[PDB]
């Protein structure tokens, strides 16, 4: 089997940049090299086949080049709609095999997270559980740290974090953090705080509520 390697698994580039994504085959594949784009929502389309042939309906901002073992996908000028993962694939010898993908991030100006904290719903409490949720929305760059503090002490067990893909329209990221406690645990404490560290603020960005209020 032939192994396809995209040595860069992610890149960050600015709107208007000419962007190059590279692919190396473990042996000469004689120009039988195809490129795919997968959007964050999972949609896949063929961009380029046989090294350099633009597939019908695809924007001409995409092009492909190469020969032997080394191939490249070029984006002539990066646009907002290009947030996606790009995969190479050899069609020289069975089994057909794919590279591991290169995710393209749009480098935008910094954006501070909007932080929101939510106490457990009365419904969940009545059932014996207590999830506290903290949304950190529309920030850039993706680098962010979130701490939960309960009566001022950090809590790490019972935390579930999730991140959106880069937003197709504004190029920001968002994050959700959920701290799940038992009702009994939740009721032993007063102050619940979700504290984010991001480059847009020299101090932590804090949202909090007190059970006694």
């Amino acid at each position: 089997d032939i192994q396809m390697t995209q040595t860069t698994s992610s890149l960050s580039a600015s709107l208007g940049d000419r962007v190059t994504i590279s692919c190396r085959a473990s042996q000469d594949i004689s120009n039988y090299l195809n490129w795919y784009q997968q959007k964050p929502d999972g949609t896949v389309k063929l961009l380029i086949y046989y090294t350099s042939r633009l597939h019908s309906g695809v924007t001409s901002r995409f092009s492909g080049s190469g020969s032997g073992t080394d191939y490249s996908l070029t984006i002539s000028n990066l646009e907002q709609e290009d947030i996606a993962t790009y995969f190479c694939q050899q069609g020289n010898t069975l089994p057909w095999t794919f590279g591991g993908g290169t995710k393209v991030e749009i480098k935008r100006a910094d954006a501070a997270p909007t932080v929101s904290i939510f106490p457990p719903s009365s419904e969940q409490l009545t059932s014996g559980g207590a999830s506290v949720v903290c949304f950190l929305n529309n920030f850039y760059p993706k680098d962010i740290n979130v701490k939960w503090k309960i009566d001022g002490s950090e809590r790490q067990n019972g935390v579930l974090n999730s991140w959106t893909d880069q937003d197709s329209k504004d190029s920001t990221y968002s994050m959700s953090s959920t701290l799940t406690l038992t009702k009994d645990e939740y009721e032993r404490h007063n102050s619940y705080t979700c504290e984010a560290t991001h480059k847009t603020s020299t101090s932590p960005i804090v949202k909090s509520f007190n059970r006694n209020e």
């Binding site: 195809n34 063929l46 069975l94 089994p95 993908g101 929305n137 999730s162 959106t164 959700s176 959920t178």
Partner: protein
């Protein structure tokens, strides 16, 4: 327009069998070889099967050879993948594609989850909130299995300012959440509800965000 639509991806127990379908339209189906390609949760793509235009010749990689069978109906314009002896590592999004130059067209995919874990409906909780011009609300969708669920707001009338987070699996149950941001003048004077659908449990529930 060329269209391919996969179906049949559901939860199946290890050792089990499942038949996927792919409905083709917008091109002369019987003139093209057709393929299945799958993608693991880690986002790696793997070619699964190809069948010749006339249906006579098939090809599979060793990973699935002897367990999967590709077939087609050149009157109904449908492609099939019969899977058997399924293993948890067969868990993937399964896509159907036309062979032309490359995998020239792809469907939206159908999710096959191979797991011993039990089907469980979500518990849906409102997230309600200290004011500003905009207010953020949300819906916590907790403890369901398998994926997927779909979340909308106000029956889809509210789409702007929505973030729905990818589900995360822990201890055989998924949790996800969705946030929506609206003008403070719109809530609570006007209602906001989240609508959560979980096909595996046949549920569709509405949860009003009450102050």
């Amino acid at each position: 327009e060329v269209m391919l639509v996969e179906s049949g991806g559901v939860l199946v127990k290890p050792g089990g069998s499942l038949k996927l379908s792919c409905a083709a339209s917008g091109f002369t189906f019987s003139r093209y070889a057709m393929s299945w390609v799958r993608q693991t949760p880690e986002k790696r793509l793997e070619w699964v099967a190809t069948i010749s235009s006339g249906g006579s010749y098939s090809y599979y990689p060793d990973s699935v050879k002897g367990r999967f069978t590709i077939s087609r109906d050149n009157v109904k314009n449908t492609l099939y993948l019969q899977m058997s002896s399924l293993r948890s590592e067969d868990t993937a999004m399964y896509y159907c594609a036309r062979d032309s130059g490359g995998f020239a067209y792809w469907g939206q995919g159908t999710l096959v989850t191979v797991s011993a874990a039990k089907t469980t409906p979500p518990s849906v909780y409102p997230l309600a909130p200290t004011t500003g011009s905009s207010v953020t609300l949300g819906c916590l969708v907790k403890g369901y299995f398998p994926e997927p669920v779909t979340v909308t707001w106000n029956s889809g009338s509210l789409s702007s300012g929505v973030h729905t987070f990818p589900a995360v699996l822990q201890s055989d149950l998924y949790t996800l959440s969705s946030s929506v941001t609206v003008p403070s003048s719109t809530w609570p004077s006007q209602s906001v509800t989240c609508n959560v659908a979980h096909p595996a449990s046949s549920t569709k529930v509405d949860k009003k965000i009450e102050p």
